[PDB]
Amino acid sequence: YGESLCFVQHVASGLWLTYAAPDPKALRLGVLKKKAILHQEGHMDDALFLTRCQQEESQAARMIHSTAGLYNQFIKGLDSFSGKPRGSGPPAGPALPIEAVILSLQDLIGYFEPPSEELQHEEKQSKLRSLRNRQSLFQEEGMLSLVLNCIDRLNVYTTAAHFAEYAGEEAAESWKEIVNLLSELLASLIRGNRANCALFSTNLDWVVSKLDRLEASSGILEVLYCVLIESPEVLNIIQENHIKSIISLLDKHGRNHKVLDVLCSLCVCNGVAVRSNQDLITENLLPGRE
């Protein structure tokens, strides 16, 4: 490693692969992508050298591949029987992988669990950096889009027992566990890292709209809490209807200190006040007094 300056070709043709840069002005001024289409003789500067990767990233990439395959199978299955009424009987041939997906969700939330605060400072910092790196590796390749698509597909139903018919009667019990664990898994990704919540701030309307169901439990609520803690730049985007939705959640689900901490974090930015949301929440919440 480090110093090889090697070249690579086919075993049969022996035709060297190299870039050519044939692109027009538009790609030339934009991205520096160089399609390495192979041709005779390549170029003189086709030398390459190797750099080995550390233990964590290879393992993480394999988990990404396996989880992506399983969740793609899940999405394909749910879309297979989505727009199809069905009577007393099984929906189709290939049933969903319920148990495998449950074990996957449990192991994934266990994997991203943060370190113990009681531990010593230096190794805690190292584990924190490793976790931040792992979150970045997962989020760059995706896995928020898959989780968002999965929960959105699941939340078309509302009963959680009866109206979830097309999956099967066997899947009656598993739906609550699936949605709760998926919310907790999204919480496990979004915790801590600034870049993750910075990317995820676009879905403020989606998450705040999702807070209207018992299956949409407090996992997404504390996801929003983490988002407001870590990504303060989104605080300007908030409007009055979101505050009304939050207060409706407080009224509908009883007293809860977590919502109070959510509103307190929502009130004040990073060392900066916001008079708009302050006046809005003060108008909506206090003077009713009920």
Binding site: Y19, L32, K33, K34, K35, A36, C53, E57, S58, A60, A61, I64, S136, L137, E140, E141
Partner: peptide
């Protein structure tokens, strides 16, 4: 497709072989 991208993708899990 395959491209000779710059140094931003060097840390990411995209260029793994």
């Amino acid at each position: 497709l395959v491209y000779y991208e710059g140094g931003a993708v060097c840390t990411h899990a995209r260029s793994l072989w």
